[PDB]
Enzyme design. Sequence first.
Site, short mmCIF file in Angstrom:
data_model
loop_
_atom_site.label_atom_id
_atom_site.label_comp_id
_atom_site.label_asym_id
_atom_site.label_seq_id
_atom_site.Cartn_x
_atom_site.Cartn_y
_atom_site.Cartn_z
CE1 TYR A 1 0.20 -7.66 -5.37
CE2 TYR A 1 -0.95 -6.45 -7.16
CZ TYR A 1 0.23 -6.81 -6.66
OH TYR A 1 1.43 -6.58 -7.28
CG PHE B 1 -3.27 -2.58 -13.65
CD1 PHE B 1 -4.50 -2.23 -13.17
CD2 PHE B 1 -2.05 -2.59 -12.63
CE1 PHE B 1 -4.47 -2.11 -11.93
CE2 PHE B 1 -2.45 -2.08 -11.45
CZ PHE B 1 -3.60 -1.88 -11.10
CG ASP B 2 0.33 -6.20 -10.72
OD1 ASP B 2 1.03 -7.33 -11.08
OD2 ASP B 2 0.88 -5.73 -9.92
CB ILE C 1 -0.11 3.14 -4.47
CG1 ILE C 1 -1.01 1.86 -4.24
CG2 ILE C 1 0.58 3.39 -5.59
CD1 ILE C 1 -1.81 1.75 -5.72
CE1 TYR D 1 2.10 4.39 -9.62
CE2 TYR D 1 0.16 3.27 -9.59
CZ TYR D 1 1.38 3.36 -9.61
OH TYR D 1 2.03 2.08 -9.12
CG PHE E 1 -5.64 -3.13 -5.96
CD1 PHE E 1 -4.55 -3.52 -6.86
CD2 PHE E 1 -6.08 -1.68 -5.87
CE1 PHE E 1 -3.82 -2.49 -7.34
CE2 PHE E 1 -5.28 -0.85 -6.40
CZ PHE E 1 -4.14 -1.07 -7.24
#
Lengths: 48, 298, 183, 108, 48, 256, 473
Positions: free
Chosen positions: D27, D37-38, D57, D83, D100
């Site tokens: 991902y 961010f990732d 999540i 979140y 994503f």
Amino acid sequence: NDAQHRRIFYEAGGAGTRARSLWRVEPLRISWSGSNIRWGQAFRLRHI
Amino acid sequence: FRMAPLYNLPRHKINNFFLSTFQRVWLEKVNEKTQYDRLIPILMKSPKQPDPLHQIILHFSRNALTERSKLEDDPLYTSYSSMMAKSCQSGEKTFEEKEMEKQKTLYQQARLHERGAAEMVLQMISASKGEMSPMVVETLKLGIAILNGGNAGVQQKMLDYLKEKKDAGFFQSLSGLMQSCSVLDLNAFERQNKAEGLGMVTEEGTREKVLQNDEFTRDLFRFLQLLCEGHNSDFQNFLRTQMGNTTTINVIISTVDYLLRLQESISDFYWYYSGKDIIDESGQHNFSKALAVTKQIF
Amino acid sequence: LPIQEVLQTLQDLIAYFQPPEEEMQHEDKQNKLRSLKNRQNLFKEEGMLALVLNCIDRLNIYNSVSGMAWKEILNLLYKLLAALIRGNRNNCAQFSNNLDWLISKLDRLESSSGILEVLHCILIESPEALNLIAEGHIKSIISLLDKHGRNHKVLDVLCSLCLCNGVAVRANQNLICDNLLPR
Amino acid sequence: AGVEIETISPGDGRTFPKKGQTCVVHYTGMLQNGKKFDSSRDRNKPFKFRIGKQEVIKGFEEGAAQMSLGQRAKLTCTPDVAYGATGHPGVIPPNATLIFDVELLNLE
Amino acid sequence: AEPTHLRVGWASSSGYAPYPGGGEGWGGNGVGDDLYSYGFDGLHLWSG
Amino acid sequence: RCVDILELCEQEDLMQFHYHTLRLYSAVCALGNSRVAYALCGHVDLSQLFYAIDNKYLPGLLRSGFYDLLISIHLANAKERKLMMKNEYIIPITSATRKIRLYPDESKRHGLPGVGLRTCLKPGFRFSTPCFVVTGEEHQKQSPEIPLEILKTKALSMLTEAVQHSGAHIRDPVGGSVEFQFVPVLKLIGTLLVMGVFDDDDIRQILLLIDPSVFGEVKGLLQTRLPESVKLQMCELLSYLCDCELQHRVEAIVAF
Amino acid sequence: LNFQLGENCPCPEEIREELYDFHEDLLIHCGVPERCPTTLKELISQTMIRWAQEDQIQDAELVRMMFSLLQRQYDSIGELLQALRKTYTISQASVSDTINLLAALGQIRCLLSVRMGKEEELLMINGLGDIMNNKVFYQHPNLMRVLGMHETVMEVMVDVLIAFPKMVASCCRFLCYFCRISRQNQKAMFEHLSYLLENSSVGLASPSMRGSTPLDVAASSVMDNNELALGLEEPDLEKVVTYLAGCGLQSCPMLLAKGYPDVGWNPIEGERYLSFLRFAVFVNSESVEENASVVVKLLIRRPECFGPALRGEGGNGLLAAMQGAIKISENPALDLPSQGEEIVHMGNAIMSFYSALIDLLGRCAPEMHLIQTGKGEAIRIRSILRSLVPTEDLVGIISIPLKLPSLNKDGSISEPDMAANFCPDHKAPMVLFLDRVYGIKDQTFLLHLLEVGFLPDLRASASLDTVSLSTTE
Ligand SMILES: Nc1ncnc2c1ncn2[C@@H]1O[C@H](COP(=O)(O)OP(=O)(O)OP(=O)(O)O)[C@@H](O)[C@H]1O
Ligand SMILES: [Cl-]
């Protein structure tokens, strides 16, 4: 501002290093005023 | 009570015992003989630019001059000061033999006081502020090492440093160190005797409690003696009234005061042993230490 | 008030509390540092820090309700305050009680630089000052970064907040991470 | 659901993740403003999670559940299912939608 | 570890001039990363 | 808009601001603030760190900042834990304990320091990969994970190439100076040594780079004219080697 | 292993050859006895000296590092000894437990460079709990001393000392257990006695924190260890006497804040200091004469350490004080705090203070053999103790009736509260004080004491022998 500053104390402890405990000995003369002070001579003590 | 032979315990407990014995017996003796023995010649050995030893001494001087409140522990200074002291402390006779010994001692001392060790000693004693510590002990030993025999050059260097610098912290620290010196005390001796009688084996610290830090006392007063050695009138007078300094400390009277304290303790010990018939081993040990300190003060 | 006399006095006082040059010899440098610390202590004991703070407050009140001269006077006052407390732990500890005052005055454009200088002096010297830094103060410093542009002295101040002479302050680290990074 | 799936590269369209299966997925998650961010492809390590255990999540798990084997698709996880009021402090700000680029490598 | 870039389309010589390195956005500007080129990558139409 | 990072070679203002940003990153995650380290892995990741450490045209300040940031985020905590538990030697008693010898053979010639079998008890460190899809803190475990097999190989390669271009006549040292070329790599090497990552062959290579004649079966860093920063790094490495020799002596004593 | 004892040592020479060979090889390895270097020591020494000779080092840190390394090259045996002093060999069965212990200890150590906070406090509390629960902690106390656990916990406590009372409580419980484990740990913690007593006034007021205060750690340092008790210095006891004197004048600030009546003195912390002094004096069923003399001298110099009842001017006597305390206890308005966990009752606090004081004094009384040997100090101390408390007060206190549980007609047991009433624990010290001082030597006195004091207690104990009341506390 505070009137209590007019007072004189024999405060001890940490007051021998401050500047509030410095006095200046000023004779009653203009010439030779920087000369030696004799016993019984009149002077003035000025708070610096 | 032969019920726990070594062949009935796990190897790890026996191995811990083996390690304790190995440290205590085989290595401890070896450690004293060989330590820093081959280092000082190489530091003094040659290859404007300061020597390595000169550089380490300047580093210690700069650390001493920096303003603080307490002399923080510094193992590097302790080790190197001990090394230098053992450098100087090299070890009826013919006149030539004694003269050559004197010359050798002077040369060994000049290896150090020509690189600024006298000023370093004075600065480190000033920086202690009056608190005993390993650094002070090593400093006094180094000063004795470079003053031994009454070295006139080192005395002149020290006096010039103390007068030019107007260093009044040196004498304040000396006064504090003298006032902190320990004398014979009967309470600790009685407690030690009680513990021994009950059966407990007295430890070395307990033995030293009766007359505590006697080596430091003798080092301090040997240093003060060596400052006046050879009838150095300038240093004999300066130790009494420090002319030019903001505050003056009288070292003659300080030595006399410590002498009175030690005398009173010795009289108390004598009153303790007056009734008894013979003096045991501990009493003789403490008497000998007190007599050594008194001889040094005299 | 005689403005020229005030200006000359402030300049002379700032030159009076002048640290020795780094090139100086170690002994002379230490003597100069000792004398400077003695003078700082003498001035602090006579309530000169409080006088400087009161002068700053009065100048700010006057400006709120000769603009260049008074701006110079305020800048000189901030420089004098920094010179009074710079390198003196007792003065910085005394000033630690005015962190709210300092941070509240961080916002104004004219006063931001002198406030940053004073605040960095306090944080470097006072070790307890970092204990009085709350989330509002950290947000104020970060907002100073946001509104005055990319100035790295604010980042120096934040780094000082994070680590206190070898001891890490987790609250400051977490606040800075949560408020500065995510945006 | 709170996740919007947009296909990129199709899969087999027949093999879907089931309960008690590990979904090895590569991902690349970024904020709705384009700020990454990732990414598991930077670390050279595919991410493994099991369906029905609530490891990841909610939006991510639902999107991978809808996805098929060998399928690369874009999943938009709204703050409700990712979140929300409290995000990862210092990484994900509060009330942030996440995007994503998820590839379902393996179902083992 | 980043998706391969492949867009095809038309461009105008008036202002379409991409230099290698960094530019608008996050760099990697191709056909459709300004208002002079009109590109297609299989899923989206790119312009501006 | 974005420019190249290397364009900071001529923009001193942005270079200073980004250097202090990297310093701030290292500060917030200082002294084992693992949560902020995981957060920072969402800003500067492993690919960027490897690129930065390997890149040769990067300004020296940015190069140092990136090396420090990598050490802080991924390596500082493990080194600190290893350093806390270093003056005590807790040795389990087994056959492996008995196998330790003072010398590696009958010739009675010193072996390479740091090479051999270690019988002292040293707790391990736990790393976890920085994933931001996982919910809960249970996944997070101390510092973020780094490969440690790519990193140490790259570190040895960088040190080798730095030493092979260490002539005094060279006019483009990496980072702008010999300090900016050697201090970062030496800090990384020391950090990886104290963490106990290098095996015997890596330690042998490092020792040959330090002094080839003494540790044999170029001239060497020690015999090269170096600034004082590189001297500090060399002193730290030598201190570690002395510690390794002392631990070897203790273990040999215990086995005997 | 002593090979210098010759025939005295029972070691065969064939075995001795191995040890001699190993020692020689080890000393050769440690470097103990212009060429190119061949070992690490020679390389380091030559490099450091060459760096120092080539250029004048302008960095202080580099100078310190170079010369530390160079000096350390010529101190191989010293460092080897210092390393062996911290070496410890364990069994393969305890490897897992020791790994867990080392992990916890490392986590605790790494928090000494972090500002204390709630999360850090919880981390340290949990770490200390895990360490205490570990088997190896109390199976290998020598290991704990080698690892320096107590020094780390003392550093933490010094840092905390007070916005984190829980951390202090955890540290103090850990150190008390540490002392209880082995006598070596007790002697190790004895070195911190001066600091522990300097902060002895922490947590005394809270009743639930007993055993979790620095004073409790100090007591654990000196407790049933005659050697350490004989080592107590006069200023160490003087600090506790000063704290007790302060407790004898000013009311407890915490009690006043919580609303307790202002009786004018603190009878709660004073009991704590009296208990510490009792540990200092009485060791293993035998009073230490030196500490007894010192404690009595210090207390007499400051009469307020005896509390209001035993002050010379205005004192009502020990019996009057105890009766007043009982009167306070019976009246809820005089002991409990105002209406507007382990509630402190003023009456029982006063009774406990006086009982602890009389117990300490009775334990300070000289042994009979010392008195019969003619020592002046013993007679002087016994005379002082006799002048302080007359036998009338002791016999009156022993005669005070108790309130014991009674069996209700409905079949339920009515048990009076034992935390706010006069209890037999307050009569035991008197029997001690009346026995070590004022020795029972006359038949008439013994019979009077038995008629008024002891017989009613024996009767009450017999009466409480029913099936229901026999098991009550
Ligand atoms: N500080 C002073 N306070 C009081 N009287 C002063 C002072 N200085 C000078 N005088 C007066 O001066 C005379 C003594 O000083 P002196 O004779 O040295 O002064 P001078 O040189 O004549 O100058 P002048 O007349 O200006 O004081 C006395 O008249 C004394 O009253
Ligand atoms: Cl004047």
